[PDB]
Amino acid sequence: DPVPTGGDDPHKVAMLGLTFDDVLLLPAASDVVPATADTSSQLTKKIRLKVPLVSSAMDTVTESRMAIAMARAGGMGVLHRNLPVAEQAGQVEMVKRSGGLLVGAAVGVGGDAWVRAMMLVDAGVDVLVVDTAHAHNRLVLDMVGKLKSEVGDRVEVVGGNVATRSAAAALVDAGADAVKVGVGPGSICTTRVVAGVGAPQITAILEAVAACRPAGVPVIADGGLQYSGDIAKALAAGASTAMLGSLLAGTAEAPGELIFVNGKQYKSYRGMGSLGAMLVPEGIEGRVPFRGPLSSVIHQLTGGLRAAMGYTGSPTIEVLQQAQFVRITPAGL
Amino acid sequence: DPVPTGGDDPHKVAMLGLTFDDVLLLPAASDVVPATADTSSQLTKKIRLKVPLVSSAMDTVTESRMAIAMARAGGMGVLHRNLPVAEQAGQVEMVKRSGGLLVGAAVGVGGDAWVRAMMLVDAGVDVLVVDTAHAHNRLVLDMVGKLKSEVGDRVEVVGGNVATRSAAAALVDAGADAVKVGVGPGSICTTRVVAGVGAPQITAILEAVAACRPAGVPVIADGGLQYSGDIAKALAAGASTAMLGSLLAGTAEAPGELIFVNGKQYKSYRGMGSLGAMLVPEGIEGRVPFRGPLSSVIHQLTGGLRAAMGYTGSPTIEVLQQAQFVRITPAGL
Amino acid sequence: DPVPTGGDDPHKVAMLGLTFDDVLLLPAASDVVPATADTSSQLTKKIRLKVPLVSSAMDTVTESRMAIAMARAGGMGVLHRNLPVAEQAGQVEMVKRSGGLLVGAAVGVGGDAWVRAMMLVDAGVDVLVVDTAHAHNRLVLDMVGKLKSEVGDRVEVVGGNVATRSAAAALVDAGADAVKVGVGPGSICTTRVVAGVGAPQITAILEAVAACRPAGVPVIADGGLQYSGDIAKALAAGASTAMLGSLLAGTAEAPGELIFVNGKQYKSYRGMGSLGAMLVPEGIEGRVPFRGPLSSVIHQLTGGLRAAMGYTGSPTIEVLQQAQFVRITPAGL
Amino acid sequence: DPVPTGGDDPHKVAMLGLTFDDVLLLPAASDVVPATADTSSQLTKKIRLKVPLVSSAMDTVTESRMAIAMARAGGMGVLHRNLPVAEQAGQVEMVKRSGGLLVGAAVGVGGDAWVRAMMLVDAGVDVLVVDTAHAHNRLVLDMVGKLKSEVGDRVEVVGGNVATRSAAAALVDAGADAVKVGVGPGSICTTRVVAGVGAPQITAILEAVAACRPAGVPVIADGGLQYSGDIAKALAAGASTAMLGSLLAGTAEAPGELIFVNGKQYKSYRGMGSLGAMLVPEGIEGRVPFRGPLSSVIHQLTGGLRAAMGYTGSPTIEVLQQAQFVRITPAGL
Ligand SMILES: NC(=O)c1ccc[n+]([C@@H]2O[C@H](COP(=O)([O-])OP(=O)(O)OC[C@H]3O[C@@H](n4cnc5c(N)ncnc54)[C@H](O)[C@@H]3O)[C@@H](O)[C@H]2O)c1
Ligand SMILES: NC(=O)c1ccc[n+]([C@@H]2O[C@H](COP(=O)([O-])OP(=O)(O)OC[C@H]3O[C@@H](n4cnc5c(N)ncnc54)[C@H](O)[C@@H]3O)[C@@H](O)[C@H]2O)c1
Ligand SMILES: NC(=O)c1ccc[n+]([C@@H]2O[C@H](COP(=O)([O-])OP(=O)(O)OC[C@H]3O[C@@H](n4cnc5c(N)ncnc54)[C@H](O)[C@@H]3O)[C@@H](O)[C@H]2O)c1
Ligand SMILES: NC(=O)c1ccc[n+]([C@@H]2O[C@H](COP(=O)([O-])OP(=O)(O)OC[C@H]3O[C@@H](n4cnc5c(N)ncnc54)[C@H](O)[C@@H]3O)[C@@H](O)[C@H]2O)c1
Ligand SMILES: O=c1[nH]c(=O)c2[nH+]cn([C@@H]3O[C@H](COP(=O)(O)O)[C@@H](O)[C@H]3O)c2[nH]1
Ligand SMILES: O=c1[nH]c(=O)c2[nH+]cn([C@@H]3O[C@H](COP(=O)(O)O)[C@@H](O)[C@H]3O)c2[nH]1
Ligand SMILES: O=c1[nH]c(=O)c2[nH+]cn([C@@H]3O[C@H](COP(=O)(O)O)[C@@H](O)[C@H]3O)c2[nH]1
Ligand SMILES: O=c1[nH]c(=O)c2[nH+]cn([C@@H]3O[C@H](COP(=O)(O)O)[C@@H](O)[C@H]3O)c2[nH]1
C-alpha cells in the first residue's frame, strides 16, 4: 500500500511543520503574576540577557543607535555587515563606549569575512554572528570552527541559520556558542517562493532544540515573529532568545528616515538578500508602520511575554521552555 | 523517530483544539419539535434558568437595565465590576427590587474585591462571579475557597476563567458552584496575540466538562459565541449555560449610546482588559451593529437553540449534552 | 489519555465530514469518451431518468414551466408546495398534459399535507416528495409510511432530508422509494449558522448510501452543488441523482422576473425557510446571475458529467458510482 | 465502525493529495553552492537538456520563436497543434535550421493526428508529444504504441497527461520515452470545476515516479508551477523536467501581442480547451503580466532552482530527486 500522500517512501514527506499561528500556549497552574516573572535568558553559553530579545543584523534594523538602545533595554543588537569593515568596527566601538554595553556583529564566510571578524574582535565585540542563509553548508561550519579555535575564549561565536536537528547538531559539533534557527520564515523572506525551501518555525525550533539542549547550547529563534505572543511561543518551543527584524524596523532607533504617506508614517524595511541590499534575490524591499521609540516597543513585547509566563505558571524562561501547546485548526484563526 | 511535528516529546503539542466553526451537530432520531423543547438548565448547583443564557460582566454589556431584561427573558445578567462598590451594590438592589429577579455580580481577587463581595452579598446578590483571566492562578483558587467558606450557603460562587481539565478540577476542589470556561476566545480578546495563550473553545469545554460533570458542577461556556448555532454547540459539548458579550452588546439595554454612522447604527463594545476599560492590554475597543431590544435578540437565540434540539432529538438540555458532532474541514466554511 | 480533540469519549466527535470541495475524482483506465457515456439513472425504484438531475421544490425554482423543461431535458421537476393545493394540483395537470412528461410535487406532514397529497395523486403526479428539513423526525417517517401504504403502487414516495446512515435506514424501513440527502448544504441554507446543525455532503452521501444501496433504494443528493463537477462527485459518492436549486434558479424557466442591475441581469432566489417564503428563519433571500434557457444550462451540466465519466472510465452512472476520490488540502483550492 | 470520512470502504477516498503549496524542501548538509550546481536532466530516455524546462504546447506559449529561444536557453519548446499540419511542420523546420536546436511538437489521436505526426518526423522533429487530457484512455495508449513501433528509433515519443501510478505504468508499457503528469493543475485549467476530476500535483508526481523510475522512464511535471520554487519541488518529487505555460506566456517570444492596460502590459494566455482555442470548455481565456525576454525569465527560474540545489546539498538533478519535504499547514501560507 502506498504512503497516503504518494509514493512508497514514508520518509519522503519527513515531517508536518508547525508555525507560530498553528499553536497556542496552554494555561497551567500558576503562582506567577506578570509582575513577578523573571525574563532573563542565555543568549550564548557565556552571555545572559535581562530581556531575551536580539535585533536582526539588517541594514534597516541595527546600526549603533539600535544596538545601544537594545542593550539599555536589557537585550542586544547585532550590527549588520552591509558596510565597510572599518565602519562596522567603528560602530562596535561606539556601543562599547556607551557604558560597556553588550554588542554583537555579523560576519559572512571567507577571507574578507575573516578580516572583518578580526577587526570586530579588536574593537571589543562580545558576540560574532556567522550570518548566513544556510549554516549546514560545509563552508559555514568551517568558518564557525575556525573562529572558535582562533578567538573563541575572547568572544562568543554564534552560527546560523538552520532549520533541522541535523544542521543544529553540526553547528554544535563545530563549536557554536549558540545556534540560530530560521530558514524561510522572515517577513521579508522569499526563499520559500524562489527556492521552494524552508521549515515552519515552531517545528524548526523543536528540532534544533532536540540537538542543542542536550549539548547545553542555547537556540536563538530568528524570523517570523509578528506579535509579542510569538516570542512566548518561540521560547516555549525551547528557544532561549528571539531575534526580531520587522517588529523593530519601525522604531525611531532603526536606520532610515520617516516616510510620511497619507498622514501615516512608515519606515523602509528590506531583506538583506533584496536587490537593494545586494541576481536572483531572496528578499523583498518594503515598508513597515512607524512604531515610535524602541524602549516602548520592547516594553510591550516584554509585557506580552510576562503575561504568557503568568498564564503558564513560569517564574523563569527555563520553566516557560517546559510549557505545552495546543494545536489549532484553520478555523482557529 | 521524532514526533511528526517536531522534537521527541509526544506531549509537547498536547491536544488538537477545536473551536465552534470546526464542528456541526449531527441530526438524530427525534420526537421533538422546536416548540416542545425545554430550554431550562442549571446555571449553578442551586440555580436553574429557564433560558440557558447569561450576559457578560462587561461595562459595555451588563448594568442594571441589562440584568433586569435578562432575568425577565429567563436568563441572568452578571453586573460588571468596573465601577465603585457602592454603585455595583446599588445596581444589585435595583434588580432585586424589580420583582425578585435573579442577578449576579463580578468581583476580582484581594482585599478590595473582598469588601466588594461582602457588599454585594448584603445587597442580596444571588451569584458571585470571581471574574478573572486565569482561575488556575493560586490566588484565584484561594478567593473562590474563601468566599465559599464565608458566604457560601447564602450565595452561589462561580469561578473562572479556565481552559483545561486540570484548571476546572482545581476550581471544583476549591468549592466552585459553577466553572466558567474561556481563555482566548472572546471577540474583543487579544490574549492569543499578545500572550500567545489560549484554548479553542469546543475542546476547552469538552475538557472542563470531563472534570466538572463527574463532580456535578455546571460549566458556563464564556466567549467566542457568534451565532445562535454556537450556543447549541457549546451546550452539546457539555456546557450547561453560555455567557454572551458581543451578541448582546448591540442591544438597547446594553450600556452606552447609539452611534449613527452612514445611516447605520452601532454601539461601543470593548474588552474589560482594553486601554479604555483599564499597560499591555489584552482587549480591544470596538463597535457592534445595533440590534434593537434584548427581548427580540434572546427570542432569536433561543429559537436557534430550539431548532438544534429538534434536529438532535433532545427534549431537554440534559439530552442535548449527549449529542454528537461531525468535524468539518476548512472547505466546510 | 484523553481524545486528542477533548474529553474521554472517542465518539463525541463522530466523523470527519467531507464536502464537495474536499475531494476530486481520480482519473482511471478508460474506453469511454464523453460522447459515448450513458447518463441515465434511477430517480426512484420504479422511475429512471435520461439525465440524472431534478429541480428543487422551491418557489423560485420549480413551477410548471420549469417542470416541463426539466422533463423535456431528460430530468424532472418537483413542484413546490408554497401555494394552494388546487394550484399545485393544477400545475401537475399542466405538466402531464404536455406530452405525458414525468413530474413530482412536494408535500409536508400532517392533515393538510395529506389532503394535498391526495389531490396531487388524483392530478396524476408520478412522485410525491415528503419535503422536510429533518426526515429523522418520527412524524416524517410516519407520513412516508402512511403515503406508501395508501397510494404506494400508484405513485412513488420520496422521503427527505437526511444526513446520516441511521436516518437513511429509517426512511428505507418506512418504505421510501428514494432517500433525499442534505441537511445544511444548500446555498441559501443558514441551518449551520442558526441551529449549528449539518453534515458535509460527500460524507452524508457516503453514509446514506451505506444504508440505501444494500436495500436497493436510490439516493438523491440535494443541496450544495455549485458546479457541474459537483454532480459527478455526488454520483461517484453513490447518489443516483442530484437535486439542484441555485444552478437552475437563474434560468428563464424559473419563476420570477429578470432583475436588471448595472447592465447585469439577476433573478431572485430564496430559501423556502426564508422570511419571505414563510419566526427564526433558516434560509435567506438573495439573487443569482441570470443564466438564460434551462436547456442550455442542462447541456453544460451534462457535458461536465460526461467529461467526468470519460476521465473515470465509466460508461454508465452505475460504474461512475464505483469511482474513487483523492482528498485535497486547503492549498488545493 | 465506518471509515471516519464516510461509508465502509477505506479505499473510496484513496489518497491525500498534496500540491506544491503543501510542501517545502528541507535544507540538508551541503557542499554545493548555487554557482556549482549542475542543472542538466533527462527530457526523455535519449534526450538530455542543460536546463530542465520545457514550454507548453499552447497557442499562446510556443511557436517557432519560443522554441528557438527555449532551445538556446538550454531547454526545449513543444510546438502547439492548433494550426494546420503544413504550418506546424514548417515551424519545426524553422527551429532545426536555427543551428540544429532540439524541438518537440504536439499531436493528438486518430488518422489526422497520424498524418500530422508523419509530417513532423519528416521535418526533423526530435520529440513527438502525444498531447491529451487523459492518456489512460485506451485510444491514447494505442497512439503512443503505434507511433513508437513506426517511427520510434528516429524520434522520441512522449505520452500524457496522467495523474496516477496506474496510468503512468500503462504509458510505460505502451513504450513511452517519457511520461507527462498533470490532470487538473494548470493555471487556466477548469477540469476540476467542470468535471470534478484531478489530482494534486506533488502526489501525482510521487505516484507517477513510483511507476516510471523503476522502468528508467523520465517524468515531465506539467501544470500548476507558479514560482521558481515549484520547479525545485517538482524535481525533488521525482520529475526530471518541468513544463511551463503561464510562467512563459508573458514573455516577448510567446505568440500574441502586447496588451497595454492602465500603463501596465499584458499578454493573452488561454487554455487549449478554451472556447477561443477550440461545447463544454475545460479551459479559460485570460491574460498574464508581460515579463520581457524569455532569456531573463529562464535565468530567474534556473537561479531559484540552483538556490534549492544549494540548500538541499544537491550537485545534480539526480541528487535533488532524493531531497525530502516538510508538509505545511494552511497557516503556513
Ligand atoms: N486577557 C485578559 O486580560 C482577560 C481575559 C478574560 C477576561 N478579562 C476581563 O478583564 C477584567 C480583568 O481581568 P483580569 O483577570 O485581567 O483582572 P485582574 O488584573 O484583577 O487579575 C485578577 C487575578 O487573575 C489572575 N491573573 C490574571 N491574569 C493573569 C496572568 N496573565 N497570569 C497569571 N495570573 C493572572 C491573577 O491571580 C490576578 O490576581 C475582568 O473583567 C475579566 O472578565 C480579561
Ligand atoms: N432548515 C430548514 O428549515 C430547511 C431545510 C431544508 C429544506 N427546507 C425547506 O423549507 C420548507 C419547510 O421545511 P420544514 O421541514 O421547515 O417544514 P415544516 O415546518 O412543514 O416541518 C415539516 C416536519 O419536518 C420536521 N422538522 C422540520 N424541522 C425540524 C427541526 N428543527 N426539528 C425537528 N423536526 C423538524 C417536523 O417533523 C415537521 O413536522 C420545505 O420546502 C423544505 O424543502 C427548510
Ligand atoms: N481538460 C482538458 O480538456 C485539457 C487538459 C489538459 C490539456 N488540454 C489541452 O487541450 C488540447 C485538447 O486536448 P484533449 O485531450 O481535450 O484533446 P482531444 O479532444 O484531441 O482528445 C484526445 C484524446 O484524449 C482522450 N480524452 C480527452 N479527454 C477525455 C475525457 N474527458 N475522457 C476520456 N478520454 C479523453 C480521448 O481518448 C481523446 O481521443 C490539448 O492541446 C491539450 O494539451 C486540455
Ligand atoms: N534567503 C537568503 O538569501 C537569506 C536568508 C536568511 C538571511 N539572509 C541574509 O542575507 C544576507 C546574505 O546571506 P547569504 O547567506 O545569502 O550570504 P552569502 O552570499 O555571504 O553566503 C554565505 C554562505 O552561506 C552559504 N549559503 C548561502 N545560501 C546558500 C544556498 N542557497 N546554498 C548553499 N549554501 C548557501 C554558502 O556557504 C555561502 O558561502 C545575510 O545578512 C543574511 O542574514 C539571506
Ligand atoms: O530569506 C531571507 N531573505 C532575506 O533577504 C533576509 N534578510 C534577513 N532575513 C532573515 O529574516 C529575519 C527577520 O525576520 P522578521 O522580519 O520576520 O523578524 C532576519 O533576522 C534574518 O534571519 C532574510 N531572510
Ligand atoms: O481576553 C479578553 N480580554 C478582554 O479584555 C476581555 N473582556 C471580556 N473578556 C471575555 O470575553 C467574553 C465575551 O466574549 P464575546 O464577545 O465573544 O461574547 C467575556 O464574557 C469575558 O470572558 C475578555 N477577554
Ligand atoms: O436549510 C435550508 N433552508 C431553506 O430555507 C431552504 N430552502 C431550500 N433548501 C434546500 O436547499 C436545496 C437547494 O440547494 P442549492 O441552492 O445549494 O442547490 C433545496 O433543494 C432544499 O433541500 C433549504 N435549506
Ligand atoms: O485543463 C486544462 N484545460 C486546458 O484548456 C488546457 N490547456 C493547457 N492545459 C495544460 O496546462 C498546462 C499549463 O499549465 P500552467 O499554466 O499552470 O503552466 C499545459 O502544459 C497543459 O498540460 C490545459 N489544461
Numbering used by the authors:
A (entry chain A), B (entry chain A), C (entry chain A), D (entry chain A): 28 to 127, 253 to 430, 455 to 509
Article passage:
Inosine 5’-monophosphate dehydrogenase (IMPDH) lies at a key intersection of the purine biosynthesis pathway and represents an extremely attractive target since it controls flux of the guanine nucleotide pool. We have overcome this major limitation by designing a variant that lacks the non-catalytic CBS subdomain (MtbIMPDH2ΔCBS), greatly improving solubility without impacting enzyme catalytic properties. Here we present the first crystal structures of MtbIMPDH2ΔCBS, including the apoenzyme, the E•XMP•NAD+ complex, and complexes with IMP and three inhibitors, MAD1, P41, and Q67.
The structure of the tertiary complex of MtbIMPDH2ΔCBS with XMP and NAD+ was obtained by soaking crystals containing the MtbIMPDH2ΔCBS•IMP complex with 200 mM NAD+. The 1.60 Å resolution crystal structure of the product/cofactor complex contains one protein chain per asymmetric unit. Although no potassium was present in the crystallization buffer and this ion is not found in the complex, the high quality electron density maps clearly show that the product XMP is present in the active site. This indicates that the enzyme in the crystal is catalytically competent. However, the nicotinamide ring flips ~180° and is in a syn-conformation in MtbIMPDH2ΔCBS•XMP•NAD+ (with χN torsion angle of 5.7°). The carboxamide moiety makes direct hydrogen bonds with side chains of T343, E458, and Y487’ (which is a part of the IMSM) and a water-mediated interaction with the O1N atom of the phosphate group and the N7A atom of adenine. As a result of the syn-conformation, the pro-R side of the nicotinamide ring now faces IMP with its C4N carbon aligned with the C2 of the IMP hypoxanthine ring (C4N-C2 distance of 3.28 Å). These observations indicate that the orientation of NAD+ observed in the XMP complex is not competent for hydride transfer and may reflect cofactor conformation stabilized by the IMSM.
